[PDB]
Design a binder for this molecule. Structure first.
Ligand SMILES: NC(=O)C1=CN([C@@H]2O[C@H](COP(=O)(O)OP(=O)(O)OC[C@H]3O[C@@H](n4cnc5c(N)ncnc54)[C@H](OP(=O)(O)O)[C@@H]3O)[C@@H](O)[C@H]2O)C=CC1
Ligand SMILES: NC(=O)C1=CN([C@@H]2O[C@H](COP(=O)(O)OP(=O)(O)OC[C@H]3O[C@@H](n4cnc5c(N)ncnc54)[C@H](OP(=O)(O)O)[C@@H]3O)[C@@H](O)[C@H]2O)C=CC1
Lengths: 375, 376
């Protein structure tokens, strides 16, 4: 049999073509299972791969309603960033969940037969995926695929922020774009675990959503007293590590500047180079594509850098990663609940009206894909 | 007796006052020595303390020729940054060298009597300093105080860059403002030790200088092909750690961008997030006072942060710190040689004409103070 899977092709011509390809469905080998995928989130990392650097204002629809095609043009300036995927037909979708419908002969694979599972196997925007049994997370009794669709990326990143805070000797943390699904989870984790947290948003609606969910400190970057508000929240929390999803713009430096201000309130001597307390900002997303810019008014005890989930998980090791996953399974519908504004079919992923919404990365407007919808 | 020491005072009034204070000279306790300081450099770290956030374009001279005063205004916007030192009379000068003229009773202190020593004691812009025996570095035979005046800050930082490179798992390095005194030392270390090094300068004449000193790789930020030149140098050297003296501006991000370009020439697969090889830029100076700005076109495996000598020495421990200091002594006049364009008295530090030159932190224009020059 064959079935459909989304593909994203950036051509050397400068064209993006998004399509639903007909792909033969493998039978699983001894150590594999075949999963009928029923739920897979559209996260920012997936959008990055889906559209690459295409200018989506140039998008045009062709194909048929059942087999849509979207083409768009990548600007000349962006082509070098695409070099490594030129002329490659890329499957899309980091993670998802569904039902195991075939299992290879091994006892590991056989033990998953008929179970509802989640996996971060890539190519999850697909009707069927043949995956190793050891890459599957069995979901709790009563969890639907939609309940388990987002078990890996956001939950483990949220837990990994706290883990990183501890490992690197900090006691409280700051998180930006905090009304994201990930931010909502982090807030739940911090409230439950007694970890002081500064949430940073950019609209009062976002601040209300978090306050409604019990957030103690919410600072609005849009506010004319933001720096005052943030400094006061940092005095309160003692946070010296930050996770910034924006990446570009000024927020990273603003946070460093406010941390140093907060630290200096308790400074006992004059320090030539500021506080000796290390302040860290991790840029773990790139929602703001403008240049990163900051003044260095925070002394010498600071760092900023990238953060990625998979290298993190490799660092803490598989046992500790498992302890984190166990928590996610146990709290799947509470601490690690995700909200989606819409559930759509594979064909609907390539509807220009759908793209127009979900490609905003707007608060409360995450879409869930059901590759098999209505069938 | 008493003798002179420079003082820098930023007052709550918004005024910087620079002066020579008359300070009673201590007699050393058992574990101390008294040094007559004959050589102390004006390094950028010192100038930071000396002038603070004062706008020196507003500086004014008063006092007398032998006892000069300089006053200047700190702008209101900088006063928060000065908060920790308001109304404090600050001694200045991290490091220097001189002769031990009195020693406390302990054998450790007695062993230094009459020796030429260097110390990083602070308050070195002073005719005499009473400091612990255990903070003195005994200089080698035939070294004048001038020869040892700069034994700590630049030599140990240069060695510390190489140490940090190794500690953090890198095999080669990049260094900016490379025609600095420190840069010239770093290039000699790397030549002698066989470390691949990319030197970045801002003027072609600085590239000429380093090439004349044997530098293998020198890139000029003013070059119209800078990014290509830097990327090629990074392919050649495999460097994945940089020390940036500029801090502000674009150079840090440029380096990261070129490092990722160089790494991706060996890319086996397509990484959604670029190379997995960690690239690190330490901003160890702030010569460029503008905002730091960069595009993040270098993947996720990167870091940028501050770097300071004293936290570093504390991290490596006293034994390893002592081994670095021993190498500095051994190569004091070769690898770790420092050039000064002028030697000035204590009173001349406060001459606005002298300030106008030394405060540029211009290549080959480092000034050496002899606190006892012209004095009894
Ligand atoms: N490094 C890593 O391994 C990983 C990173 N991530 C990152 O975490 C972040 C959250 O993911 P997720 O919970 O799925 O996101 P959501 O789609 O659920 O929420 C996104 C949030 O970002 C805000 N936002 C969008 N654009 C900007 C902007 N330019 N500046 C400031 N805020 C903005 C939105 O607010 P508004 O309504 O105002 O648009 C919204 O609240 C993303 O950057 C994602 O890439 C997630 C997992 C791992
Ligand atoms: N973090 C730490 O613990 C320490 C840091 N340092 C730092 O090392 C650096 C070198 O010190 P040192 O060798 O004594 O300095 P020098 O005075 O010998 O040389 C300074 C160099 O900086 C260049 N420069 C000056 N201003 C700028 C600018 N705006 N942008 C780019 N380049 C500039 C000069 O070139 P030009 O002629 O073009 O002006 C010159 O080549 C300094 O930043 C110093 O603070 C040193 C020791 C320890």
């Amino acid at each position: 049999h064959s079935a459909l899977q989304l593909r994203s092709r950036i051509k050397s011509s400068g064209e993006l073509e998004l399509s639903l390809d007909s792909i033969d469905t493998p039978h699983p080998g001894p150590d594999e299972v075949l999963i009928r995928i029923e739920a897979s989130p559209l996260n920012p990392s997936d959008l990055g791969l889906l559209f690459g650097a295409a200018d989506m204002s140039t998008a045009k629809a062709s194909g048929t309603a059942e087999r849509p095609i979207v083409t768009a043009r990548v600007p000349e300036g962006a082509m070098r960033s695409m070099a490594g995927r030129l002329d490659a037909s890329m499957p899309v979708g980091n993670e998802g969940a569904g039902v195991v419908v075939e299992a290879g002969s091994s006892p590991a694979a056989q033990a998953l037969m008929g179970k509802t599972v989640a996996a971060i196997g890539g190519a999850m925007y697909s009707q069927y995926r043949c995956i190793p049994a050891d890459q599957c997370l069995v979901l709790p009794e009563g969890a639907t695929p939609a309940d388990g669709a987002s078990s890996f990326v956001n939950p483990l990143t949220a837990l990994g922020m706290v883990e990183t805070m501890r490992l690197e000797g900090h006691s409280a943390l700051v998180h930006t774009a905090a009304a994201s699904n990930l931010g909502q989870m982090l807030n739940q984790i911090c409230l439950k675990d007694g970890i002081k947290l500064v949430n940073i948003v950019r609209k009062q609606e976002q601040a209300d959503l978090l306050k409604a969910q019990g957030a103690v400190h919410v600072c609005n970057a849009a506010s004319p007293t933001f720096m005052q508000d943030l400094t006061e929240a940092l005095v309160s929390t003692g946070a010296t590590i930050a996770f910034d999803a924006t990446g570009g713009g000024k927020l990273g430096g603003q946070i460093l500047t406010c941390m140093e201000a907060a630290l200096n309130k308790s400074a006992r001597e004059y320090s030539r180079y500021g506080s000796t307390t290390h302040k860290q900002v991790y840029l773990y997303g790139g929602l703001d594509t403008s240049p990163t810019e900051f003044n260095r008014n925070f002394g010498m005890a600071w760092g900023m850098g990238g953060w990625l989930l998979f290298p993190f998980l490799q660092k803490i090791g598989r046992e500790r990663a498992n302890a984190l996953k166990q928590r996610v399974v146990a709290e799947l519908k509470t601490t690690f609940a995700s909200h989606y504004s819409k559930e759509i079919s594979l064909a609907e992923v390539l509807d220009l009206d759908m793209i127009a919404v979900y490609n905003k990365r707007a608060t409360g407007e995450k879409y869930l894909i059901n590759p098999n919808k209505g069938l």
